[PDB]
Design a protein around this ligand. Structure first.
Ligand SMILES: *[C@@H]1O[C@H](CO[C@@H]2O[C@@H](C)[C@@H](O)[C@@H](O)[C@@H]2O)[C@@H](O)[C@H](O)[C@H]1NC(C)=O
Ligand SMILES: *[C@@H]1O[C@H](CO)[C@@H](O)[C@H](O)[C@H]1NC(C)=O
Ligand SMILES: *[C@@H]1O[C@H](CO)[C@@H](O)[C@H](O)[C@H]1NC(C)=O
Ligand SMILES: C[N+](C)(C)CCO
Ligand SMILES: C[N+](C)(C)CCO
Ligand SMILES: C[N+](C)(C)CCO
Ligand SMILES: C[N+](C)(C)CCO
Lengths: 534, 538
């Protein structure tokens, strides 16, 4: 028995495991229950706190992955399967993971809490890319990650109902956050210094905690990587949530809210997943059936309204995007696009693609999109058209929503830093045309290139170390710059006047101005004017 | 005769003429100025198609410019050459249908290609007698035969009650056409070749040239065309029959001829010319710039359909066309209507003034269309920078009215069989009196093409002299062959034709030709493809 691996939390005693990081050992406490299993009658319901336990709870292995759809696009392909569940699926999945330095820190240490993405329909804290041992060992950080319910189980909502109120997957995250407040000191973490970070739906989740009052007392700083609470995919109205839940119920043979939800609770988990993609209103990409709902409770208003009127004075935020946000999604439903060729497309394929990539757009709005993104010097060039299609999907869904949030957060008193991540992993298995896709910064921030067995370059390992420092410096201070270090160049705050952000690549930081400023004016200013008028 | 210069006596269909020997820097030229080509369109003839000049007895003196057609005279900037170089330089009269011919001296012995100039001035102003349209340099240096005609402007040339007998519309274009017919019949008398006739014009003159291209009866009267900063398509060069009728009827009311068309037109004919000019600007539907009250009308006769329809469906197989724009097409127009703009300061404007400016500069835009314009031309890194806003306002007016219509025209003509050459003119005259912020404004290429810098008394630089000579060669090579390039020379860089595929045009400045691609390709897609679609849906 190693006393560094024994911790008493409020629920009782835990035993962790000593894991090996390249530079030395870390302590890992994996699969710690933070809620009562949301099973049987508790399906679709808010999470309840985990009842205390007797003896020593074995916290040496990852727990089950929340029940979810498993990708089948490219069977056997690492680029897709690296995001697939790596443990058994179960509705009994409300567990979290803590990595700390070995030995346990002597003084209270800044805490980073990771919230995974996956379109609110997928993901797990147990994926290899979310491995916290490197940040723990190298930067001395306490890293936490939780599982939260996804798909119907996390976000199926009959708004106004007692039994399926919506947003329960977000309440799972919140409960994990409350757990950190109550318990992280036992591991040597500082509950007065908690930084949330997440990517994609995880970043939208971070944003929603920023916009929901009861969450704000549970953290101090936030990082949103390639995702925002505002924008076209991260939320639905109560009406649209009801529509989708009612339709799924119909599809599984479930005929008053209470009756409807009681019958949904009788169905095997896979029966629900079998139909979750049949409820979207359009043929589309970058759209997910069961996501956070504007309920007037967790979200008191739309994210748009809340970011416009919010006060964010005592908040620091780091936000950014990858170089090619849209490319990943094109292979999931835009004809002409494949990982197996260069995906050089015709103009016809581009116009059709725009309707799928911007599915809520009217005919006129779609025409505006096509005319904006066409290079009128090379209107039928397939390379241009392929890269424009990617651009449309990335800008609409990530870059411009990020630019919008960044600007409103800064105008309303927040301290904001922004980045574009432009380094394409040497080990990437997707084709070159996809560039730096959605999600492929994460492995560097977590510091996987520091593991020699994974075959990243020396340059990539130095780069990872740099990024780990920006992120942990941000966690410690609310400022990603290295404070003992002179010689930078310094990463300046993002402001509405100057609009400064930095490139994160193998070269030293370069400061740029305006995140797609002209094109984002189109998405964020013009298209809405077109909508309210048509 | 007996005692005079035998080299200045010429007979035309109407009778005998005596010209004048003029001095150009390199030698003498022959000038025949103020040759009448129509019966004076006065009295009962006001608003009516021109009638050919009846023959005269004896020798008509053709040694001085004749009357300028009755028109509005600019008084925005008294004493200022920038404005006054465009003002009438001879008596204003309705008796104004006279043309001018310059030729080498002695006259050419073999048939020489003819250039015919059509002046601009928004269809409300202009004269062939202005110093910047002086044909002597082209005549002397290039051996050109050059012809220019006065044509009626304003109400006199373009007031229309469409469908009526007495004010059918487009009579100023019919004046131009009568002059073209005159050249066909008579220009061989001066050594000119009626089988080689190139039209050229600027602004409204360029629009006019384009309308001769789109009207079949004109097509037999010329072979090639140059359109400088003007097009028959676009937002200002024509009006519908309905809008023409509305403006004519309002004008009539304003001058005490309240409304049957015969009666209305008969009362208009009793009015003093100056009365008509005094109310001319009161009939425009919006507060605007780059809009003119009385312009060509889509009458279903001269113009069988809209210029837009006609350029989309036309066969332009046997046409060569040279077209282009100056660097700063919009700036000139800003000081005549947009609050905040002036020749006497830097015209740094606020964002409020930009938004107001856009409504005046795109006067037919809905609220949604105008916010589309504002959002496109705003620099979102520097949305309130006065220098950017000033320059963006200029760009809006220039692109809307000239640059994008020219791109549209060049594309349609090229797609439908024409040989097209395109330019951007980027040299600012060292003698320009407009301020620096205005750049290279609308109209300030003309003095180079005509060769005024060859006159040492005009104080242009030596480099400007050489530049002028180049331009004269391009224009006259195009007149001769339908190709501005020199057959003898080579690299000396070549001017490739404009094509829809490659979109090539050249920079005209003091440096050797540089080839560029796409005339404001992205922005003109906004004007030429998106806004119309907005319009159709909205
Ligand atoms: C530039 O000028 C515009 C027009 O006003 C004229 O010039 C100014 C300086 C006055 O002295 C006035 O007498 C003239 O009529 C102004 O509208 C504009 O505000 C001026 N721009 C600036 C920034 O000074
Ligand atoms: C790969 O691209 C080709 C053409 O480049 C396209 O037709 C095809 O659908 C793509 N995917 C397949 C079917 O392998
Ligand atoms: C040109 O230059 C001379 C000598 O400086 C000057 O006196 C004359 O008035 C100028 N003329 C013009 C056309 O500006
Ligand atoms: C098609 N799915 C929605 C299942 C995958 C999203 O990328
Ligand atoms: C958001 N994920 C990283 C889970 C998928 C995109 O690569
Ligand atoms: C059109 N102008 C500006 C030249 C005169 C208006 O009064
Ligand atoms: C258009 N004009 C040339 C006639 C006036 C100055 O631009």
């Amino acid at each position: 028995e190693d006393p560094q691996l024994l911790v008493r939390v409020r629920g009782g005693q835990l035993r962790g495991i000593r894991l090996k990081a390249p530079g030395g050992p870390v302590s890992a406490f994996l699969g710690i229950p933070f809620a009562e299993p949301p099973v049987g009658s508790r399906r679709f319901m808010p999470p309840e706190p985990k009842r205390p336990w007797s003896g020593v709870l074995d916290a040496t292995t990852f727990q089950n992955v929340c029940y979810q759809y498993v990708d089948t696009l490219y069977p056997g392909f690492e680029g897709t399967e690296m995001w697939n569940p790596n443990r058994e699926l179960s509705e009994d999945c409300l567990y979290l993971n803590v990595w700390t330095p070995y030995p346990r820190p002597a003084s209270p240490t800044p805490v980073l809490i990771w919230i995974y993405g996956g379109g609110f329909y997928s993901g797990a804290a147990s994926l290899d890319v979310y491995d916290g041992r490197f940040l723990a060992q190298v930067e001395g950080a306490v890293l936490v990650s939780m599982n939260y319910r996804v798909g119907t189980f996390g976000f199926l909502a009959l708004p106004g109902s007692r039994e399926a109120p919506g947003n329960v997957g977000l309440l799972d995250q919140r409960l994990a956050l409350q757990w950190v407040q109550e318990n992280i000191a036992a591991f040597g973490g500082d509950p007065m210094s908690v930084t949330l970070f997440g990517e994609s739906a995880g970043a939208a989740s971070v944003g929603m905690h920023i916009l929901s009052l009861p969450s704000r007392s549970l953290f101090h700083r936030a990082v949103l990587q390639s995702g925002t609470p505002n924008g076209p995919w991260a939320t639905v109205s109560a009406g649209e949530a009801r529509r989708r839940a009612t339709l799924l119920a119909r599809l599984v043979g479930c005929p008053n809210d209470t009756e409807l939800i009681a019958c949904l609770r009788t169905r095997p988990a896979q029966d629900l997943v079998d139909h979750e993609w049949h409820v979207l209103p359009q043929e589309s990409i970058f759209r997910f059936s069961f996501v956070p709902v504007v309920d007037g409770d967790f979200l008191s208003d739309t994210p748009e309204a809340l970011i416009n009127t919010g006060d964010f004075q005592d908040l620091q935020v780091l936000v950014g995007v990858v170089k090619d946000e849209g490319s990943y999604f094109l292979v999931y439903g835009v004809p002409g696009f494949s990982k197996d060729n260069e995906s050089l497309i015709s103009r016809a394929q581009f116009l059709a693609g725009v309707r799928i990539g911007v599915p809520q757009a009217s005919d006129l709005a779609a025409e505006a999109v096509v005319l904006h993104y066409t290079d009128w010097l090379h209107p039928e060039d397939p390379t241009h058209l392929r890269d424009a299609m990617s651009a449309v999907v990335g800008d609409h869904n990530v870059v411009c929503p990020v630019a919008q949030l960044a600007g409103r957060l800064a105008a309303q008193g927040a301290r904001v830093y922004a980045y574009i991540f432009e380094h394409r992993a040497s080990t990437l298995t997707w084709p070159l045309w996809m560039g730096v896709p959605h999600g492929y910064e994460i492995e560097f921030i977590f510091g996987l290139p520091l593991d020699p067995s994974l075959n990243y370059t020396t340059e990539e390992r130095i780069f990872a170390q740099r990024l780990m420092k920006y992120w942990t410096n941000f966690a410690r201070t609310g400022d990603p710059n290295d404070p003992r270090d002179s010689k930078s160049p310094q990463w300046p705050p993002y402001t509405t006047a100057a609009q400064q952000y930095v490139s994160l690549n193998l070269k030293p930081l370069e400061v740029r101005r305006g995140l797609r400023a002209q094109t984002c004016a189109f998405w964020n200013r013009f298209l809405p004017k077109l909508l309210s008028a048509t």
